[PDB]
Design a protein around this ligand. Structure first.
Ligand SMILES: [Zn+2]
Ligand SMILES: [Zn+2]
Ligand SMILES: [Zn+2]
Ligand SMILES: [Zn+2]
Length: 141
């Protein structure tokens, strides 16, 4: 560090002085050692102090001051009802062979048992086995 510079100076605040005070950047002690020697501040006439200071007022009336915390809820309820009343009907008649529920086909008066292990045809109007008696006399809708 070898650079010649200068910092902000000040003057003796005495009405009978004003000779001039030279304040070095690394100097923290202002005193009229050349005249009416008394210690004061470089920014104010507080008689020297440590900290901040600004001439003609700092311009600080307020800043920040607020402390308050709130609690949440996170509490709720949940419900649901599935259903009520179940009416079941029967549209099927038991097969004469496998006894499986055979349903009718609207539009035709013939119904055959379509079952994996059956395949038994019978008359809808008069339920009987497919024979010569009712070979389909009225097998037409
Ligand atoms: Zn002085
Ligand atoms: Zn000061
Ligand atoms: Zn059957
Ligand atoms: Zn018949």
């Amino acid at each position: 560090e070898e650079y010649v510079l200068q910092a902000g100076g000040v003057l003796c605040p005495q009405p009978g002085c004003g000779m001039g005070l030279l304040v070095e950047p690394d100097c923290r002690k202002v005193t009229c050692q050349n005249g009416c020697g008394y210690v004061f501040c470089r920014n104010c006439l507080q008689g020297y102090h440590i900290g901040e200071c600004l001439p003609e007022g700092t311009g600080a009336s307020a800043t920040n001051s607020c402390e308050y915390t709130v609690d949440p809820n996170r509490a709720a309820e949940a419900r649901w009802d599935e259903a009520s009343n179940v009416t079941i009907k029967v549209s099927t008649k038991p097969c004469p062979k496998c006894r499986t529920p055979t349903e009718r086909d609207g539009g035709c008066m013939h119904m055959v048992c379509t079952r994996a292990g059956c395949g038994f045809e019978w008359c809808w109007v008069c339920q009987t086995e497919w024979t010569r008696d009712c070979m389909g006399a009225h097998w037409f809708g």
